[PDB]
C-alpha cells in the first residue's frame, strides 16, 4: 500500500476508565506500526494501539463497554469486534474511515477470555496483518480455585505470514507462530507476538506456586495444542467460563479464537517451556519460557 | 470418469416413513449431479439424492432404521455409513453396485447430531466428491434448555477440492470451505454446500430470540472453529448429547465429523455472520449470515 | 548423519521394576533402528528401545519414577520428557550424551494417558524422527465405568515425514499418518507406527463386548478426529482423567499430545475400522481394524 510506505506510527497507550458501577469507556486506535516479529524481520503491522496482538482489555461481568476507535490509518478503514459482547455486527462492528472516530456501545455479560479483532472485509487480511487481541471478563463470583492461585499471567498465540499477501494468508503455512504476554498488574511484561522475547525474558515465578494463565489463540488460521512442559494442568476452564471445568489435562485444545483459563503447579526450580504441541508451530516460534526460582 | 461425462442426474426427494413406534424406513439414492459450489464453478458431485451435503435425516432416540440405497451411478459402487448407528461395518455398510439397491437395518440409540457418508473405498474420494450429510437423533427427554429456544436451523460445514483429484484430496489445501442449511420444518431453506447462498439469502430470525443450531463439520479433512459474530453461545451440547453441556463458549471446536447443538441469543436487529474462525477457510467461502429483524 | 549410515540397532526390551509401594524403576535406551513404516519404505528412526512409538509404560497414580536413559546413538544427544510427571525441565529432562546414561526422578500424581518424548533441541526433529510414546497412569480409584469393560487396548497416532528433513517437518504435509498398538497384557499385539500392520492383523474382540481404548495422538504436528466405525463412544474421559467424562461422542478431538480413554460396544460380528476422520490422514495410513467374532 503506497500510503503505508515509510509509515511507522508510535504506539499510543490504551485509554480506559470506569464511568459507572456497570459501565466502562475504552478508547483504542487503529495504526500502522513496525514490529520485529523474528530477529531481523520487521512486519509493518496493522494494529490496535501499535501493539500486535493489541493491548489487553479487562472488564467485569455485566459491564457495558462504550468503545471508541480512532482510525489513524491513512487509507484503510478499520473496525472492532469483541467476542465478549452481544451486539449487532452490521450496526456496532462497522467501519471507521481513515482519520475518523466511531463510538459503539454493548454489554459484556459472559465471563471468560475472549478474542477481539478488526472486522473489516476481508477479515482474514485485517486479522493476519495484526489486528487481534484479548478481552478478559472477570466472573462475578470468581472461579472455584481462586484461593489457590499464587500468580497469574496472560498469553496470546498468533501466526505471521508473508507480508500483506492474501494468497499466503489463505493457502500458505505460517511463517512464524508466536506467543505474547499482556500485563495484568504493574510490573508484568507486555510484549508483542514475536519468536524471541519470552525466551530471552522469561515469565517469572517461585517454586511451589500455582500459576494461572489466561490464554487465547487468536489465529488467524491455526488451532493450538497448549502445553506447559514439566507440569499438568490441575484445572482448566474452557473459554474462561467457570462452568466448563476440566481437571488434570496435559494439553488444552484451543480452536482459532479459542480461550481458556489454565492452572498448574511448578514444583521445582528451573525453566519451564510453554508451547503449542503442534511442534511445527513451536519450531516456527511458539515457545515461551517460565523461569521458576526459590525467591 | 468417462461414464460420468455429460451426466447430471436430477435431484430425487428423500423418502422416509415411520413404520412402527420405534422403526423408520429411509430410502436414498447415490447419484451424479452438477452443483454450483462457487459463482461460475460447477462440481459434478457424487451425492446422495442430488444434494451435497445430502438430505437431512431426523429420527428419534431408539429408532431402528431400515435403510435402502438405490445406486444410480453408472459405474461406481456406493454405500452408506451413519455415525448414529450401531452396525457391523463389513456387513451393514457394504457396497451397492451400479443400478442396484441394498437394504440394511440398524439401531440409532444415542441422541445427537451425526455425520453420515459413503463408506466405499477410498473413502476420502467418496466423501470429498460430495457423499456426506447429517442425521439428527432427537433425545427421548429433550435438552434441558428446550423451553428457552425460539427458532432452530441446521448448518453443515464441508470442503471442496480440485475435481476428483486424489492427490489434492490427500495433500492439498481446500479450494472452498462452505456452509449449507438443511430444512427441519416447512419453509426452512434447504441448500447445498456453496460459497454464496447463505450470504445472499441469509437465515432469518427475530430480535431477542434464542436460536438453536444443529451443526456438523463433515470435512473431509479440516477441523472447524465455529463462531457466531455478535453473540456468545449460552449453551453447547457436544455431539448433541445432552450430557455434554458447556456454557458461555465463544467458539466451538469441531473435529472432522464432529457435531454440536449450540444456542445463542440475538439481542439487536442486524445481520450476524456465522463463520469458522479459521479465517483462511472463512475467506474461501465459510461465512453464512443470519438476518435478525423486528418481525 | 554420516555416523548413522548402516546403523540398525536391534530393539532392546523396556526394563521396569517396582521398588516400593510408590516407587518404580524404568530403564530405556535411545537407539537408531530401521522401521518399515509403509510397504517397501524403511525409515531409520530415532527411537526409544527400537520401537516407534516407544514401549508402553504403565504406572500407578502416586508413583515416583526413577528413570534411566541409556543413549546408544553414536553422535546425537537424547533426553526424556514424560507428560505424566511434575519435573524441572532444565534439570530433569536434560540431555544424555552418546554412550552415556542419565537417571532422573519425578512423581506421576495425575491419572491419565500421557505422551512421552525426547526433549532435545530441536524437539520437532527428535519427535518427528520417532522419539515419542505413551505412559499410562492408572487412577487410584479407577474409572466409574470399569465394571462394564470387557477388553482393552492401547492405540497411538503419529505422523512420518521425509527422512530427517527439517524443512518438511516444519512446512510439509505428512507422508504417512499411522496407528500402533502397545501391549497391556500378555498376548496383546505390540506394533510400530506403520500403514498396514493393524489392517493385516486386526485387534480382536467378541460380539457384544464393551471395549476400552487408551489413545494418544503424539503428532508431531497434526490433531486427530478419532472415530470407530459402526459404534458410538458410550463414555470418554479426556486425557484419561476420570473427571473429564463425556458421553455418546461419535468422534473425539485430540490435540497434538492429547490423550483419552474411550469406551464403546461392538454389537455385531464383523470388522470395524478405527480412523482419524481427517480423511486425508486416514488415506495416508491412519486406519486400524478391530475384528469382532462370536468367540
Ligand atoms: Cu450493580
Ligand atoms: Cu459512555
Ligand atoms: Cu482493520
Ligand atoms: Cu471473531
Ligand atoms: Cu498450517
Ligand atoms: Cu500456593
Ligand atoms: Cu501439573
Ligand atoms: Cu415404545
Ligand atoms: Cu422395514
Ligand atoms: Cu460413494
Ligand atoms: Cu465416518
Ligand atoms: Cu488445510
Ligand atoms: Cu425467547
Ligand atoms: Cu451470546
Ligand atoms: Cu501407600
Ligand atoms: Cu530408585
Ligand atoms: Cu532425541
Ligand atoms: Cu511434550
Ligand atoms: Cu498437515
Ligand atoms: Cu460386556
Ligand atoms: Cu457405540
Domain spans of chain B?
A: 1-295
List the single residue in A91, A119, A219 with the smallest CB-CB distance to B268.
A91
Secondary structure (DSSP) of chain C: -GGGTT--PPP---EEEEEETTEEEEEEEEEEEEEEEETTEEEEEEEETTBSS---EEEETTEEEEEEEEE--SS--B--EETTS---HHHHS--B-TT-EEEEEEEE-S-EEEEEE--PSSHHHHHHTT-EEEEEEE-TT--TTGGG--EEEEEEEEEE-STT-HHHHHHSPPSEEEEEEE-SSTT-----SBSSHHHHS-EEEETTPEEEEEEEEEESS--EEEEETT--EEEEEETT-TTSEEEEES-EEE-TT-EEEEEEE--SSEEEEEEESSHHHHHTT-EEEEEEE--
User: How many angstroms is it from C246 CA to the middle of ligand 16?
Assistant: 38
State the Cα–Cα distance between residues A69 and A14, nearest whole angstrom.
11
In eight-state DSSP terms, residue A170 is: H
Q: Which residues of B88-117 are buried (b: 16+ CB within 10 A; e: fewer)?
A: bbbebbbbbeeeeebebebbbbbbbbbbbb
Which of B90, B108, B242 to probe by mutation at the C interface, max C CB count within 10 Å? B90
Alpha carbon separation from C138 to A39, B47, B270, C25, C243 (Å, rounded): 45, 46, 53, 16, 13
Classified as helix, coil or strand, A121 is coil
> Any alpha helices (H) in B21-180, and if so which ranges?
89-92, 123-128, 166-171
- A88, A114, A238 member nearest B268 (Cβ): A88
- Residues in A closer than 8 angstroms to C239, CB to CB, are 248-251
Pairwise CA distance, residues A274 & A259, whole Å = 16
| Ligand approaching nearest to the C-alpha of A149 | 6
Q: What CA–CA distance (Å, rounded) separates A31 from A33?
A: 6
| Distance of alpha carbon B87 from alpha carbon B68, whole angstroms | 15
Closest C-alpha to A169, from A205, A222, A207: A222
Quote the CA–CA distance of A259 and A255 in Å, as a whole number: 8
Q: If 0-12 CB within 10 Å is exposed, 13-18 middle and 19+ buried, where does residue C196 land? A: middle
What are the residues facing B64 on neighbouring strands? B23, B107
d(CA A266, CA A206): 8
A285: left (phi over 0), alpha (psi -120 to 50) or beta: left
- What number of CA atoms fall less than 13 Å from residue C178's CA on the CB side? 25
- Cβ atoms C87, C103 nearer than 8 A: no
**From the CB of residue A116, how many other CB atoms can be counted at a distance below 10 Å?**
25
How many angstroms from the chain centroid is the CA of residue C185? 16
| B94/B104 Cα distance (integer angstroms) | 9
The angle formed by the CA atoms of residues A208, A214 and A215, to the nearest 5 degrees, is: 115
Give the strand pairing for C203-206 and C287-293. parallel
**Residue C158 Cα distances to A63, B193, C176, angstroms:** 46, 32, 9
User: C-alpha cell of A28?
Assistant: 483504542
Neighbouring residues of A74: CB distance < 8 A, sequence distance ≥ 6? A3, A4, A7, A32, A98, A99
Give the strand order in the sheet containing B57-60. Answer: B57-60, B132-138, B112-117, B81-82
C-beta of residue C21 within 8 angstroms of C-beta of residue C1: no
CATH topology of domain A1-295: Immunoglobulin-like (2.60.40)
For the record, the C-alpha cell of B274 comes out as 456465522
Angstrom distance (rounded) from CA B62 to CA B180: 27
Q: What is the strand order of the sheet B245-249 is part of?
A: B176-182, B151-160, B210-219, B259-265, B233-238, B245-249
Q: Rounded to whole angstroms, how far apart are CA atoms A52 and A44?
A: 10
DSSP notation for A20-39: ETTEEEEEEEEEEEEEEEET
- Residue C162: half-sphere exposure toward Cβ, Cα within 13 Å: 9
- The answer on whether B132 is annotated among ligand-binding residues is no
Between strands B203-206 and A57-60, the pairing is: unpaired
d(CA B230, CA B232): 7
A268 contact residues in C (CB cutoff 8 A): 86-88, 91-92
CB B293 within 8 A of CB B207: yes
Out of C223, C277, C280, closest to residue B170 by CB? C280
Q: Using CB atoms, which chains have 3+ pairs under 8 A with C?
A: A, B
Q: Which of C86, C92, C219 lies at the smallest CB-CB distance from A279?
A: C219
Contacting chains of A (3 CB pairs or more, <8 Å) are: B, C
Q: Read off the C-alpha cell for B126.
A: 467418496
Q: Is B165 annotated as a binding residue?
A: yes
Residue position matching grid coordinates 519427535: C127
- Say if the Cβ atoms of C170 and A283 lie within 8 Å: yes
> C272 CA to middle of ligand 4, Å?
39
Ion ligand 20: protein residues whose beta carbon lies under 5 Å? C 150, 210
Q: Is B167 exposed, middle or buried (0-12, 13-18, 19+ CB in 10 A)?
A: exposed
Helix (H) or strand (E) holding B280: helix B279-283
Q: Which residue of chain A is at minimal alpha-carbon distance from B225? A: A255
B159 is in an annotated binding site: no
The Cα of C71 is separated from the nearest Cα of chain B by a number of Å equal to: 36
C226 neighbors C251 (Cβ within 8 angstroms)? yes
- Backbone φ and ψ for A197, nearest 5 degrees, come out as -60, -45
DSSP 8-state symbol, A124: H
How far is the C-alpha of A239 from the C-alpha of A215, rounded, in Å?
A: 9
**Sign of the dihedral defined by the CA atoms of residues C103, C26, C28, C38, in that order:** negative
- Is the N-terminal amide bond of C271 cis, ω within 30° of 0? no
> Using an 8 Å Cβ cutoff, are B194 and B136 in contact?
no
3-state secondary structure of B56: coil
The whole-angstrom distance between residue C233's C-alpha and the CA centroid of its chain comes to: 20
Amino acid at each position: 500500500i503506497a500510503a503505508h510506505k515509510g509509515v511507522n506510527q508510535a504506539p499510543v497507550p490504551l485509554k480506559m476508565e470506569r464511568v459507572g458501577p456497570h459501565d466502562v469507556h475504552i478508547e483504542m486506535t487503529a495504526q500502522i506500526t513496525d514490529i520485529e516479529i523474528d530477529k531481523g524481520k520487521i512486519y509493518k503491522a496493522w494494529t490496535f494501539n501499535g501493539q500486535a496482538p493489541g493491548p489487553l482489555v479487562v472488564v467485569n461481568e455485566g459491564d457495558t463497554i462504550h468503545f471508541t476507535l480512532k482510525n489513524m490509518d491513512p487509507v484503510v478503514p478499520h473496525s472492532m469486534d469483541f467476542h465478549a459482547v452481544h451486539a449487532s455486527p452490521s450496526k456496532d462492528f462497522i467501519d471507521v474511515m481513515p482519520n475518523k472516530s466511531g463510538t459503539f456501545t454493548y454489554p459484556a455479560n459472559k465471563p471468560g477470555v475472549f478474542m477481539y479483532h478488526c472486522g473489516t472485509k476481508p477479515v482474514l487480511q485485517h486479522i493476519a496483518n495484526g489486528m487481534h487481541g484479548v478481552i478478559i471478563v472477570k466472573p462475578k463470583n470468581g472461579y472455584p480455585t481462586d484461593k489457590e492461585v499464587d500468580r497469574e499471567y496472560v498469553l496470546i498465540q498468533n501466526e505471521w505470514y508473508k507480508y500483506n499477501d492474501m494468497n499466503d494468508f489463505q493457502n500458505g503455512v505460517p511463517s512464524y507462530v508466536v506467543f505474547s504476554s499482556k500485563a495484568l498488574k504493574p510490573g508484568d511484561p507486555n510484549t508483542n507476538g514475536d519468536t524471541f522475547t519470552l525466551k530471552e525474558k522469561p515469565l517469572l515465578a517461585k517454586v511451589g506456586e500455582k500459576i494461572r494463565l489466561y490464554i487465547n489463540n487468536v489465529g488467524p488460521n491455526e488451532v493450538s495444542s497448549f502445553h506447559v512442559v514439566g507440569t499438568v494442568f490441575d484445572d482448566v476452564y474452557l473459554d474462561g467460563n467457570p462452568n466448563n471445568h476440566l481437571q488434570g489435562m496435559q494439553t488444552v485444545m484451543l480452536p482459532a479464537s479459542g480461550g481458556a483459563v489454565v492452572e498448574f503447579t511448578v514444583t521445582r526450580p528451573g525453566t519451564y517451556p510453554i508451547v503449542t504441541h503442534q511442534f511445527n508451530h513451536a519450531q516456527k516460534g511458539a515457545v515461551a519460557m517460565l523461569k521458576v526460582t526459590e525467591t
